[PDB]
Amino acid sequence: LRQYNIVGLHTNIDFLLNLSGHPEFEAGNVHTDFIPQHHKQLLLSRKAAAKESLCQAALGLILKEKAMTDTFTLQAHDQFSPFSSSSGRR
Amino acid sequence: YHGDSVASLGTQPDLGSALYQENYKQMKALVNQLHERVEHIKLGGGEKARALHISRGKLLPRERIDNLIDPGSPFLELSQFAGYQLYDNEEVPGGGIITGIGRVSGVECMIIANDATVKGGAYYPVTVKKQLRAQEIAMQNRLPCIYLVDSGGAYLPRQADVFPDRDHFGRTFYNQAIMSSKNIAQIAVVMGSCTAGGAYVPAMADENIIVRKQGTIFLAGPPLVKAATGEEVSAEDLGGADLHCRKSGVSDHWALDDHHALHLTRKVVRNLNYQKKLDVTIEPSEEPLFPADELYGIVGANLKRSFDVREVIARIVDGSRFTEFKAFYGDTLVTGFARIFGYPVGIVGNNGVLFSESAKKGTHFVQLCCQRNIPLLFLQNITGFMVGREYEAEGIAKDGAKMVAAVACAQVPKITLIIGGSYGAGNYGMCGRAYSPRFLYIWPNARISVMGGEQAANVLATITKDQRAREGKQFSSADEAALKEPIIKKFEEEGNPYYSSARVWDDGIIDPADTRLVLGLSFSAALNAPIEKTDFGIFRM
Amino acid sequence: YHGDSVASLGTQPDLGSALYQENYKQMKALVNQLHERVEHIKLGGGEKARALHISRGKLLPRERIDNLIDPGSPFLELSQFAGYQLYDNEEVPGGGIITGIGRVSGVECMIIANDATVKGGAYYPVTVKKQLRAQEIAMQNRLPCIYLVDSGGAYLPRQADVFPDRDHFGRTFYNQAIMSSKNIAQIAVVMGSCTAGGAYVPAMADENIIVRKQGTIFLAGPPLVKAATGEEVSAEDLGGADLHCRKSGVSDHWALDDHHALHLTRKVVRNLNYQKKLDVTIEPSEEPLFPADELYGIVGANLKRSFDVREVIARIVDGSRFTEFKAFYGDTLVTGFARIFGYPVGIVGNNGVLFSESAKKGTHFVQLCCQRNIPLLFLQNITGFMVGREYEAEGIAKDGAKMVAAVACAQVPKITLIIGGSYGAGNYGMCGRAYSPRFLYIWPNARISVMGGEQAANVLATITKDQRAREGKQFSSADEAALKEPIIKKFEEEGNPYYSSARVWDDGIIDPADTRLVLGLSFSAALNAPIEKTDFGIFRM
Ligand SMILES: CC(C)=CC(=O)SCCNC(=O)CCNC(=O)[C@H](O)C(C)(C)COP(=O)(O)OP(=O)(O)OC[C@@H]1O[C@H](n2cnc3c(N)ncnc32)[C@@H](O)[C@@H]1OP(=O)(O)O
Ligand SMILES: CC(C)=CC(=O)SCCNC(=O)CCNC(=O)[C@H](O)C(C)(C)COP(=O)(O)OP(=O)(O)OC[C@@H]1O[C@H](n2cnc3c(N)ncnc32)[C@@H](O)[C@@H]1OP(=O)(O)O
Ligand SMILES: O=CCCCC[C@@H]1SC[C@@H]2NC(=O)N[C@@H]21
Ligand SMILES: O=CCCCC[C@@H]1SC[C@@H]2NC(=O)N[C@@H]21
C-alpha cells in the first residue's frame, strides 16, 4: 500500500493505512461493526511536518528548477556556458 | 577527428617547501581580508537605513537582484569596491549602486540597481562612473539593460563633478538613447521615488514598470517645485503609478509591489524575442588537471620573487592543454592557444622584462589571433620594460610601439587580468584600461603605477640636483631625503589594489581560486556580439 | 529558463444568457449561409461543361490541385467569392480561377489554376485581379508559382477592362519576369489549349510541362489565324506537345496525361533546391484554453452591441497567454505580445473609438514591434474615429496621421482581420488594403464603408440645404427624403461582406471557428521571406 501512490485524485489510501496500522487489526480480532467505533481514530488531522521534510521539499523544488534549466540549455546553442549551471555562485 | 593524444602543461608543486608554505599563508591572509571587506560592503548603507527601507514595504537591492535573475543562476557583480575610502568622511558602500551581469529568462542581461540606503540613492561621482562603465560594457557586448531605479538624483554638494562634463550624468541618457537605436533593449523598473534626473530614465527606456504607491516619476520633486516655482503638491499626486499610467502615458506596466514588478520584467525579457548565436567553434568542456588553490602557494604576495605563468595557465585552461607559439624566441613572453569552457582563447602572458623579441612575438601572435577571430586573454605580471643604450639603438621603443598598435587595433574580444605588477608603458602594451578590454580584473596582490616609488624618487632627485648644479646652487642630502620620502610613501599608497579599485580602474578584485570561473562567465558575456574584421594601421617595420 | 507561471486571458461565457443564445443563433445562421454558398461555388461552371471537360479525358481543376499538393496537406484557398454576383447576368464561380497556397514536396507554393468550365477559361477583369493578387502575395512572401494553364485568353466583350491598363493582363507577364529575376521559381503546366495571351505563360516560365494531346501552345488560335492572315491549320499542328517539344523548344517536359504532368511538377519542385530558414524565435505550440465556437456567442451578428476583443485574443492565441502593453493608457486600443503556433506576434485590436492616446499607444507599439522584428496582427472593429472641436484642438487628426505613417512604414509581416465594422480613416490607421498587409480576412458579420449610411445622408442633406439657403432657394423635406433614402440603400448594399469579397478587396470570408488555423497557415507562408530593417519617415511630434 505504501508502494501504491496516487497523484491528482483524492483517495482512501490514508484510511487503509490507518486501518492496517491500528494494533487492533494486528491482534487479528475483526468485528463487523469494528470500524464505526474506531471511525474517528483512523480519520485524524495531519501532523505538523518535521523540518527534515520541509528541507527535502525545498531541495526537490531547487532540483526541479535545475532540471528545467538543463532542458533549456539542451535546447540552446551555447551548451557549455557557465551561466547554464545552477551553482548560485557569487 | 580529435583523438590525438596531446601533452599537457603543469607540474605538481612541492607542498613541503617552506616557500610554498609562506606564499600560501600570505595569499590566504589577503583573500580572507578581501572576503571580510566584501561582506562589510554587502551589509549595505546602514542598519537604520535598512530598517526604514523595509518599513516602506520595499525590497533591498540585493534581494531584488536575487529575485530577478533565473533561479540558481550565477551572478557576476562588477566593481564591488567602488567608493571604498574614496571620500574622506563619507562611507559609500559599493558606490551606492549595484551593477552586474546575470541570466534573465535565459538571456544574459546587465542589471543596474540603485541602492536607496546610501544617501537616499544620491549619485556620487563614483556612482556615475560605475554606471557609465556598466553601460559601456553592455554596449560593447550587446546586452540588454535593466535599470532598477530608486535614486534621489545628483548629489548636490559634489555637483561640479556630476553634472557638466562629457563623462558625467548626461552620458547616461546619451548611452541609453544610443543603445536603444542599436536594437539593444532598455527596461526601467521604477521601484521608488525619483526626485530628478532619474525621472528621465523611465522616459527614455523602451518599456517601463512602476510600482503602485512606491515608484513616483516627476521631473522636479515637491521640494524642487517649491524652490523653483513655489507650487505645493504631494509626491503621489506629482508622480504616482496611477497618475502616470492613466493619463500621462509615461508608464507602460503597472505593478502591485516589487515581486510583481520583477515578474513583469522577466515576462518582458522573455518577450524580447532574442536568440544567442555563436560564431566560434565549440568543443566539450573539461576541468583542469590541477587544483586552483595551489596558485596561492605558486604566486604568493611578494612581487620580488618570480613565478612561471605556465603554472597559472595550466591551472585555468581546459584539461591543462596548451599549444605554445614560438616557445624559444622571446622566452620572456608566453603566447599560445587554449580553450576555456570550450571557447578558444589566445593567451598572452608575461614571464619577465619585455624585450624586442618579445614585442615582435606578441605582435605576430596578435595578428594571428585577429586573423582567425579568436578572443584574447592577457596576463600582466610586469617587472618593467627593457631600457638601455643598446636597446634604444635597436628600437626597443619602436617594438613596444608595434605591440601597442597591434593590441589597440584588435577587434576580437580582449580580457585582461593583472596577476602581478603593472608599470610603465608595459601596461599599455599588455591591453590596459586605455585600450578598451571587455573586462579587467586584478588579483589581491597586484601593484599598478607609472613606475616604482624608488625609481621616481631617484629620477626627481637627479633632475633637481642637475637643475641646481646648472643654476649654481647647492643641493644638500637633507633636501634629497625630503624630496624622496613623500614620493615613496605616495607611490606606496597609490599602488594598492584597493586604491585602484575604489576608483573604477578595473571590474573588481577576484579570488585567484575563482579566476577560471569568472573568465568563463566573462567570455560567455563577450560572445553575444558578433566579431567584426580587424583593420590595422601602419606596421612600422 | 521558461518555467515562470504566467496569468492567462479569457473568461467563461454565460451559456445560459439570452444574449449569448441570440448571438450564437445569428452567427450560426450566417456561417451556414456562407458554407452553402461556398459549396455552390465549388460545384463549378456547370454540369454540361463539367461533362464535356471530363469527356476530353482531363481532370477538373480542384482534382488537379488535390493531386498536386502533398497528401493530407491543408490547402489555403484565396478569394473563393470573386465574381459573386459581380456581373448582372453572367455567373462566374470563383472568378473562373483558383488561387491558393499549398505544400508541394515540402515547400510552400502558390498554385494558380484556370477553370476551363467557366466560359472556356476566358479572363474576366475579376479573374485578372485575382491572379494579380495571387502573384503579388507570392512575390511578397517569396513563394514559387505554379500555373496550371487552361485558358481561352482575354474575354473579348470586356476587353477594355482586361487589356490596356497597368493592373491589366500585361502585369501578369511583368510579375512573372520580375519574380523570375529574383530567383523565385515559375513552373507552368499547360493542361489544355491556350488560344492567345496564355501562350506567353509557358514561354516566360522557368520550366514547362505540357500534356501530349491536350495542351497546345500557339500565339494565335486557328480562328485568330484565319481572321488575321487567313491561313487554315488544325490546333494540334499549330500547337501540340510533340510539335513543341521536338523542334520549337518551348516545352521542357512531355507528359502523357494530367497525372503524369502533376508527378513531373512535383519532381521539379523537389529539384528546386530550396530550404526554408526561420529568422524568429520558436517556442512549442499550445492550444488555447477556450473553445473557438464560443466566439459565435461572444461576437454575434449585430454591430450595435460591443464586445471585448480580449475574448477573441484569448480564443486564438497559444495557451491564452497575453502580455498587454500600456493597459490603462488609451484603453480603447488593445496592444500586446502573444504567440500563435510558436510564432511571436504583436496583436493590435480595437475596443472602441480611436482617441489621441490610443493612436500614440499604437504608434509606440508598432515602433517596438518593428524594432524587435515581430509580425503584426491587426483586429479591426471600428465604431468610428473620435472627432470634435476639443479633439481637433489636440490634433486628433495628427495622431491618426502618426499611426497611419507608423503602420505604412512598417516592414515586418502584417496580417489584418476585420471582425466588425471598418469605417473612415480608422480603416487606414488599422492596416487596410491600401497599406499592403500580407493577408486580409473578414468575418461574415463585418461591414466596410467610408462611413455609415445615415451619416453620409445627413452630410449630403446639410450640404444641399446650406447651398440652397446661400442661393436663396427653398429646400423642402420631400427633397430631403429623396436625397436620403437612395444613399441609405446604396450604403447598405455596398457594405455587405459578399459585396466586398466579390471584388478582390480581401483574401476571403472565414468561419470564426477556423480563424486561428488560417492565421497559422498565413503566418507560416509569411515567414518564407527574410525580414528587412524598417525605415521610418518624419514623426510629427
Ligand atoms: C538634473 C539631474 C540629472 C539631477 C538632479 O537635478 S538631482 C536634484 C536634487 N535632488 C532632489 O531633489 C532629490 C531630493 N530627495 C528627496 O526628495 C528625498 O529625500 C528622497 C527621494 C531622496 C528620499 O529620501 P529618503 O526617504 O531616502 O530619506 P533621507 O533621509 O532624505 O535620505 C538621506 C538624506 O538625503 C540627504 N541627501 C544628500 N544629498 C542628497 C541628494 N542629492 N538627494 C537626496 N537626498 C540627499 C542625505 O544627506 C540625508 O541623510 P544624512 O546624510 O543626513 O544621514
Ligand atoms: C493578347 C492577350 C493577352 C489575349 C488575347 O488575345 S485573347 C484572344 C481571343 N481568344 C481566343 O482566340 C480563344 C478562343 N477560344 C477557343 O478557341 C476555344 O473555344 C477554347 C480554347 C476556349 C476552348 O473552347 P471550349 O472547348 O471550352 O468550348 P466553348 O463552347 O468555346 O467554351 C465556351 C464558349 O466560349 C465562349 N467565349 C466567350 N468569350 C470567350 C473568349 N474570350 N475566349 C474563348 N471563348 C470565349 C463562351 O461564350 C461560349 O460558351 P457560352 O457562353 O455560349 O455558353
Ligand atoms: O616599469 C618599471 C621599471 C622602471 C621604469 C621603466 C621605464 S617607465 C618609462 C619607460 N617605459 C617603459 O615601459 N619602461 C620605461
Ligand atoms: O466611422 C464612422 C463614424 C462617423 C464618421 C467619422 C468620420 S469619417 C471622416 C473622418 N475620418 C475618421 O476616421 N473619422 C471621421
UniProtKB/Swiss-Prot annotation, chain A:
Probably a dodecamer composed of six biotin-containing alpha subunits (MCCC1) and six beta (MCCC2) subunits. Interacts (via the biotin carboxylation domain) with SIRT4. Disulfide bonds: none annotated. Biotin-attachment subunit of the 3-methylcrotonyl-CoA carboxylase, an enzyme that catalyzes the conversion of 3-methylcrotonyl-CoA to 3-methylglutaconyl-CoA, a critical step for leucine and isovaleric acid catabolism. It comes from the Eukaryota. Acetylated. It is linked to 3-methylcrotonoyl-CoA carboxylase 1 deficiency: An autosomal recessive disorder of leucine catabolism. The phenotype is variable, ranging from neonatal onset with severe neurological involvement to asymptomatic adults. There is a characteristic organic aciduria with massive excretion of 3-hydroxyisovaleric acid and 3-methylcrotonylglycine, usually in combination with a severe secondary carnitine deficiency. This is Methylcrotonoyl-CoA carboxylase subunit alpha, mitochondrial.
Curated annotation (Swiss-Prot), chains B, C:
It catalyses: 3-methylbut-2-enoyl-CoA + hydrogencarbonate + ATP = 3-methyl-(2E)-glutaconyl-CoA + ADP + phosphate + H(+). It is found in: Mitochondrion matrix. One of its GO terms (biological process) is L-leucine catabolic process. Changing G330R: In MCC2D; produces severely decreased wild-type residual activity. Changing E77Q: In MCC2D; severe and mild form. The modification N6-succinyllysine is found at K48, K119, K473. Probably a dodecamer composed of six biotin-containing alpha subunits (MCCC1) and six beta (MCCC2) subunits. Belongs to the AccD/PCCB family. This is Methylcrotonoyl-CoA carboxylase beta chain, mitochondrial. The gene is MCCC2.
